[PDB]
Structure 1
Amino acid sequence: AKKIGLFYGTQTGKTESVAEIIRDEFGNDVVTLHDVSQAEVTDLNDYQYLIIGCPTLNIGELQSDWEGLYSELDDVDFNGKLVAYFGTGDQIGYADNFQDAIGILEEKISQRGGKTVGYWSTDGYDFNDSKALRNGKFVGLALDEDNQSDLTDDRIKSWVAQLKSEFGL
Structure 2
Amino acid sequence: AKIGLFYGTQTGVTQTIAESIQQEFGGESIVDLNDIANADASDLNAYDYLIIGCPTWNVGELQSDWEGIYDDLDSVNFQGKKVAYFGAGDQVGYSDNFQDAMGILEEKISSLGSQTVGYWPIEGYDFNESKAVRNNQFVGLAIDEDNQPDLTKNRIKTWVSQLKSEFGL
- Name the CA distance, whole Å, in 1 between partners of 2:153 and 2:45: 29
Counterparts of 1:1-169 in structure 2 under 5 Å?
2-28=1-27, 29-169=29-169
- Name the CA distance, whole Å, in 2 between partners of 1:11 and 1:113: 29
In the alignment of these two chains, the number of paired residues is 168
List 4+ stretches of structure 1 deviating above 3 A.
none
- Name the CA distance, whole Å, in 2 between partners of 1:72 and 1:99: 22
- Name the CA distance, whole Å, in 2 between partners of 1:107 and 1:15: 20
- Shift in Å at residue 163 of structure 1? 0.3
- Shift in Å at residue 114 of structure 1? 1.3
Give secondary structure in 1 for the equivalent of 2:125.
coil
- Shift in Å at residue 58 of structure 1? 0.4
- Name the CA distance, whole Å, in 1 between partners of 2:131 and 2:89: 13
- Name the CA distance, whole Å, in 1 between partners of 2:48 and 2:37: 21
- Shift in Å at residue 3 of structure 1? 1.4
Give secondary structure in 2 for the equivalent of 1:71.
helix
Give secondary structure in 1 for the equivalent of 2:44.
helix
Unaligned runs of 5+ in 1: none
Q: CA RMSD in A?
A: 0.6
- Shift in Å at residue 71 of structure 1? 0.8
